[PDB]
Swiss-Prot record, chain B:
Biological classification of the source: Eukaryota, Metazoa, Chordata, Craniata, Vertebrata
Gene Ontology CC entries for this record: external side of plasma membrane; extracellular region; extracellular space
Presence of the UniProt keyword Disulfide bond in the record: yes
Keywords, sorted A to Z: Adaptive immunity, Cytokine, Disulfide bond, Glycoprotein, Immunity, Inflammatory response, Innate immunity, Secreted, Signal
GO biological process: adaptive immune response; apoptotic process; cell death; cell-cell signaling; cellular response to interleukin-1; defense response to fungus; defense response to Gram-negative bacterium; defense response to Gram-positive bacterium
PTM comment, free text: N-glycosylated. Found both in glycosylated and nonglycosylated forms.
Subunit: Homodimer. Forms complexes with IL17RA and IL17RC receptors with 2:1 binding stoichiometry: two receptor chains for one interleukin molecule. IL17A homodimer preferentially drives the formation of IL17RA-IL17RC heterodimeric receptor complex. IL17A homodimer adopts an asymmetrical ternary structure with one IL17RA molecule, allowing for high affinity interactions of one IL17A monomer with one IL17RA molecule (via D1 and D2 domains), while disfavoring binding of a second IL17RA molecule on the other IL17A monomer. Heterodimer with IL17F.
UniProt protein name: Interleukin-17A
Molecular function terms, GO-annotated: cytokine activity; protein heterodimerization activity; protein homodimerization activity
Length: 98, 98
């Protein structure tokens, strides 16, 4: 066990023009800290071209990143957690299919 | 102070095809947990077009996300931290300039 103390009191539209734009989706888990995680969902299957139209010869893909979260241990505990890895979507990029 | 206990013991080649590709940069901070954060740096100023060439009519931009990290409190403490917000580049997207 590597138990440390953590003080949870935190110290102190641009991407709308993307060819692979995204919206935010609320992921809520009461057994986790942070309980609310905003994930990116690509608006389209294709990428928006210069004309403002969707081109399906390319794909908008979510960028999946491993992040660390705190899991309540034992369950429902207000003050004790275990570090845990989860995969979250942090944005979208445009890719040329294989 | 909202002090909790945390047990720190936990129980990419597709994005190479991006029109706004990026490389990973190691961001190391001994006063922070995680000490190592992999940050995205856009490979080009422009985006890769259908011909496979870097096209400057569009821009590769880094996607910045606010990320929570643990800051050693007091400084150099091996087992006590305070939650803190930083901005991290997690990937690149292609945008149409304004
Ligand atoms: C300011 O709140 C932004 C929020 C968010 C959500 N969850 N979250 C997890 C982490 C961890 N840090 C990391 O995972 C980390 F530092 C680095 C890895 C490499 C990027 C922490 C957790 C607490 C800790 F006490 F466990 C120390 C670790 N921070 C965050 C930040 N966001 C951001 C955006 C998202 F998709 F990117 F998540 N959507 C969100 O909802």
């Amino acid at each position: 066990p590597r138990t440390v103390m953590v003080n949870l009191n935190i110290h102190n539209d641009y991407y709308n023009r993307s060819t692979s734009p995204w919206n935010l989706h609320r992921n809520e888990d009461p057994e986790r800290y942070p309980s609310v995680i905003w994930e990116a969902k690509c608006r389209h299957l294709g990428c928006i071209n210069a004309d403002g139209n969707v081109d399906y010869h390319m794909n908008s893909v979510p960028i999946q990143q491993e992040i660390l979260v705190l899991r309540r241990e034992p369950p429902h505990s207000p003050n004790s957690f275990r570090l845990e890895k989860i995969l979250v979507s942090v944005g979208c990029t445009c890719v040329t299919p294989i």
